[PDB]
């Protein structure tokens, strides 16, 4: 609802395009439109300057499961 870009004519385009109002009212909405959709950047980061974040993503899942 806030962050995004604006054109010369003044048309605001949001990063996720105003999907919070309709999709955040079910658990399936949080699972599909928030975690699954937005995890793409972190899981596609290998081979670029952001690959350290993918490595830490996996390592932190490992430590969490280790605590059990």
């Amino acid at each position: 609802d806030v962050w995004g870009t604006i054109s010369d004519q003044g048309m605001v385009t949001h990063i996720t395009g105003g999907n919070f109002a309709q999709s955040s009212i079910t658990i399936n909405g949080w699972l599909r439109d928030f975690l699954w959709a937005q995890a793409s950047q972190v899981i596609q980061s290998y081979g670029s300057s952001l690959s350290a974040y993918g490595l830490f993503f996996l390592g932190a899942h490992f430590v969490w499961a280790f605590s059990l």
């Binding site: 309709q22 999709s23 399936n28 909405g29 699972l31 599909r32 995890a39 899981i43 996996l58």
Partner: peptide, 23 residues
Amino acid sequence: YLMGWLRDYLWLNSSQLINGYNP
């Protein structure tokens, strides 16, 4: 490598399943 398992098996094959019902 394990990121291959996470991305190409789990994440990729869920797309239909989590759209069984939606807005």
